[PDB]
Amino acid sequence: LEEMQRRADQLADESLESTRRMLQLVEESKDAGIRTLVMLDEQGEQLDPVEEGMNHINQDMKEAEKNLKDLGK
Amino acid sequence: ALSEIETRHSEIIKLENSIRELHDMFMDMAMLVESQGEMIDRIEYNVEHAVDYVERAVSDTKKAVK
Amino acid sequence: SNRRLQQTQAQVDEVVDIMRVNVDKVLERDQKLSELDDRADALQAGASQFETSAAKLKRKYW
Amino acid sequence: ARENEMDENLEQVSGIIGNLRHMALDMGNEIDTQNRQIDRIMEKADSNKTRIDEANQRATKML
Ligand SMILES: [Ca+2]
Ligand SMILES: [Ca+2]
């Protein structure tokens, strides 16, 4: 039994160590996910002016096409 | 008893492996998003360049039709 | 205790599946962003050339 | 005491896993929305490429 007593306490200790490692891992995962969400928000805030730049280019190029056609007539 | 202790230990070890996998996935997600942030920086810079080029070009075309 | 642990394992596995899907989504985001990167570079080049040509036209027709 | 720490650690972990589930879902929805926006931007970019190519060709012909 004492063989199994000491083996059992060994396994219990290793299990506790495992739960402690789990806690540090999930805390790291939470920080990583929050950082990811922050980066995604900032990148979307850059995407917005990109879409508006596309629209601005489209509008201006319509205007320029009209001007060019008038120049050649 | 020993059977219950061994079973619970193996369960905790596999749960830790699963948690390790989830952690690795969160970390890789963060890294991928940062990497893509670099490409979005380049996209925004080039689009600003093109917007300004086109504004000046259309100003010139309007001036030409004057 | 054992049941608690099985349920925690189930939780972790569900989140793992969700994050696998998210990784697929963000890899497709990477592909889209690479294509848009190329397009934006080519676009500012074309716009630069058209700017030069528009200035020349400004001179020529005024 | 070891049993108490193990049990409370497991409960804490479970709570943080709930948090991570919420974060993963939000992450996926934000990425879907941004993929849609990037598709819109790519379409506008194709249109602009075509418009600028044709405008360059025309201006070159007129010079
Ligand atoms: Ca946005
Ligand atoms: Ca800038």
Curated annotation (Swiss-Prot), chain B:
Signal peptide: none annotated. Phosphorylated by CK2. Residues 2-64 form the t-SNARE coiled-coil homology domain. Expressed predominantly in cerebral cortex, hippocampus, cerebellum, adrenal medulla and retina with weak expression detected in non-neuronal tissues. There is a cross-link at K62, K63, K66 (Glycyl lysine isopeptide (Lys-Gly) (interchain with G-Cter in SUMO)). The record marks K63, A64 as: (Microbial infection) Cleavage. It is found in: Cytoplasmic vesicle, Secretory vesicle, Synaptic vesicle membrane; Cell membrane; Synapse, Synaptosome. It comes from the Eukaryota. Plays an essential role in hormone and neurotransmitter calcium-dependent exocytosis and endocytosis. Part of the SNARE (Soluble NSF Attachment Receptor) complex composed of SNAP25, STX1A and VAMP2 which mediates the fusion of synaptic vesicles with the presynaptic plasma membrane. STX1A and SNAP25 are localized on the plasma membrane while VAMP2 resides in synaptic vesicles. The pairing of the three SNAREs from the N-terminal SNARE motifs to the C-terminal anchors leads to the formation of the SNARE complex, which brings membranes into close proximity and results in final fusion. Part of the SNARE core complex containing SNAP25, VAMP2 and STX1A; this complex constitutes the basic catalytic machinery of the complex neurotransmitter release apparatus. The SNARE complex interacts with CPLX1. Interacts with STXBP1. The interaction with STXBP1 promotes assembly of the SNARE complex. Interacts (via C-terminus) with KCNB1 (via C-terminus); the interaction increases in a calcium-dependent manner and induces a pore-independent enhancement of exocytosis in neuroendocrine cells, chromaffin cells, pancreatic beta cells and from the soma of dorsal root ganglia (DRG) neurons. Belongs to the syntaxin family. This is Syntaxin-1A. It comes from Rattus norvegicus (Rat). The lineage of its organism: Eukaryota, Metazoa, Chordata, Craniata, Vertebrata. The gene is Stx1a.
UniProtKB/Swiss-Prot annotation, chain C:
Keywords: Acetylation, Cell membrane, Coiled coil, Cytoplasmic vesicle, Membrane, Phosphoprotein, Synapse, Transmembrane, Transmembrane helix. GO terms for molecular function: calcium-dependent protein binding; calmodulin binding; identical protein binding; lipid binding; molecular adaptor activity; myosin binding; phospholipid binding; protein-containing complex binding. Phosphorylated by PRKCZ in vitro and this phosphorylation is increased in the presence of WDFY2. Residues 1-62 are cytoplasmic. It comes from Rattus norvegicus. The lineage of its organism: Eukaryota, Metazoa, Chordata, Craniata, Vertebrata. The chain holds residues 28 to 89 of 116 of the full protein. Residues 4-62 form the v-SNARE coiled-coil homology domain. GO terms for cellular component: clathrin-coated vesicle; cytoplasm; cytoplasmic vesicle; cytoplasmic vesicle membrane; glutamatergic synapse; membrane; neuron projection terminus; perinuclear region of cytoplasm. It is found in: Cytoplasmic vesicle, Secretory vesicle, Synaptic vesicle membrane; Cell membrane. GO terms for biological process: calcium-ion regulated exocytosis; cellular response to insulin stimulus; eosinophil degranulation; establishment of localization in cell; exocytic insertion of neurotransmitter receptor to postsynaptic membrane; Golgi to plasma membrane protein transport; hormone secretion; long-term synaptic potentiation. It is a single-pass type IV membrane protein. This is Vesicle-associated membrane protein 2. Nervous system specific. A higher level expression is seen in the brain as compared to the spinal cord. Expressed in hippocampal neurons. The record marks Q31, K32, L33, R39, A40, Q49, F50, A54, A55 as: (Microbial infection) Cleavage.
From Swiss-Prot, chain D:
Keywords: Cell membrane, Coiled coil, Cytoplasm, Lipoprotein, Membrane, Palmitate, Phosphoprotein, Repeat, Synapse, Synaptosome. One of its GO terms (biological process) is positive regulation of hormone secretion. The modification Phosphoserine is found at S14, S47. Part of the SNARE core complex containing SNAP25, VAMP2 and STX1A;this complex constitutes the basic catalytic machinery of the complex neurotransmitter release apparatus. Recruited to the SNARE complex following binding of the SNARE complex component STX1A to STXBP1. This complex binds CPLX1. Found in a complex containing SYT1, SV2B and syntaxin-1. Found in a ternary complex with STX1A and VAMP8. Interacts with HSC70 and with SYT9, forming a complex with DNAJC5. The interaction with SYT9 is inhibited in presence of calcium. Isoform 1 and isoform 2 interact with BLOC1S6. Interacts with CENPF. One of its GO terms (cellular component) is endosome. One of its GO terms (molecular function) is lipid binding. Palmitoylated. It is found in: Cytoplasm, Perinuclear region; Cell membrane; Synapse, Synaptosome; Photoreceptor inner segment. t-SNARE involved in the molecular regulation of neurotransmitter release. May play an important role in the synaptic function of specific neuronal systems. Associates with proteins involved in vesicle docking and membrane fusion. Regulates plasma membrane recycling through its interaction with CENPF. Modulates the gating characteristics of the delayed rectifier voltage-dependent potassium channel KCNB1 in pancreatic beta cells. The record marks R40, I41, Q57, R58 as: (Microbial infection) Cleavage. Belongs to the SNAP-25 family. This is Synaptosomal-associated protein 25. Residues 1-62 form the t-SNARE coiled-coil homology domain. The gene is Snap25.
